[PDB]
Every structure is written in C-alpha cells, then in structure tokens.
Amino acid sequence: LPEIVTLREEIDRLDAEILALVKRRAEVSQAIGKARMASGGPRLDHSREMKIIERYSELGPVGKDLAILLLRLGRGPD
Amino acid sequence: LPEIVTLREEIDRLDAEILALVKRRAEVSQAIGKARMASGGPRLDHSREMKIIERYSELGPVGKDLAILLLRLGRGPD
C-alpha cells in the first residue's frame, strides 16, 4: 500500500526507541539484581514486581505478558 | 535496600515511556491493519513482520517474544 509508507516509518522510529528503552531497563534491572544478590535475601521484591505487572495490565492481557518478558530481561546473562 | 531507591525511580520512568510508546505503536499498527483490511489482500506483510522480529532478536530470545507480543497488540480490539 502507498498510503502506509509513513505509518511504517513511524513504526520503525517507535521500535528504535522501544529497543533503546528496553536495553536500558535491562541494565538497570540487572544492577538492581546485583545489589539484591550482593545483599543475600530475596532476589526479587515480590510486592514491587507485582505492582509493575498490574501497571502494565492497563494495556490489556497482552500487557501482563509484556511485563513478564521485561522481568525476564532483568536476569543476569545465563 | 536503600541504595536501590534511585534505580527504582529510573525503572518507573522507563516504564512510563515504554507504555506510552507501546500504546502509540498499537495505534499505528491498528491503522496499518485498517488500511490493509479496507484494501482486501493479506492482513500482514509477512516479509516486513519477519524483519521486525529479526531486529528485536538483537536483544536475545526474549527479544523475539517481545516483537511477537507487539505484533499481537496491533490487532483490532477483540
């Protein structure tokens, strides 16, 4: 379709930004993981993680799955 | 942990931006879906969608799943 060329541009721009933000979030999450590890004790703040998941549910059920994936991106490289 | 207070702030800020970007992407994707529907013919550009998925694999295997979820967010509300 010729009339979707500019919509596709916008997608590509959005994806560039999403990827940068997700990468940064993975770095921050991993730093939080390293501080929690270093301190012994729970590897997650479960109440905190559940609240994040509930925020993402504003998007629908796919929103919960997104938060779940972002949670997995916070793991140490394994 | 007291030393993770500012890291948690950064997460919250990143999540605010991720959610706004994902919502916008869902709007654009749905507009592309509506143009494709209106035109009859394939509901997806499969080569295009596969290229998006491959870009997201730069993140790892979780990256492919992310692209997959974003693809589902582009559906008409159902």
Residue numbers in the entry:
A (entry chain D), B (entry chain D): 11 to 88
Sentences from the paper on this structure:
The first committed step toward l-phenylalanine and l-tyrosine is the conversion of chorismate to prephenate, catalyzed by chorismate mutase (CM). MtCM represents the structurally simple AroQδ subclass of CMs composed of two intertwined three-helix subunits.
The activated loop is highly kinked, either because of Pro52 in the evolved variant or induced by binding to MtDS. Interestingly, the Asp55 side chain of N-s4.15 engages in a hydrogen bond with Arg18 from the other protomer across the active site, a catalytic residue that aligns well with the corresponding active conformation in the MtDS complex. The crystal structure of N-s4.15 shows that Pro87 introduced another kink, resulting in reorientation of the C terminus. However, in the variant N-s4.15, the C-terminal residues are less well-ordered compared with MtDS-activated WT MtCM (average B-factors of Pro87 and Asp88 are >100 Å2), and beyond residue 88, hardly any electron density is visible, suggesting that the C terminus is flexible in solution. Whereas the guanidinium group of Arg46 in the evolved N-s4.15 is still not in an ideal position but is pulled toward the newly introduced acidic residue Asp55, it is more similar to that of MtDS-activated MtCM compared with native uncomplexed MtCM. Overall, most active site residues of N-s4.15 adopt conformations resembling the ones observed in the MtDS-activated WT MtCM. The crystal structure of N-s4.15 implies that its improved activity is due to a combination of pre-positioning active site residues for efficient substrate and transition state binding, tighter packing of the active site, and an overall stabilization of the fold, as reflected by the increase in the enzyme's melting temperature.
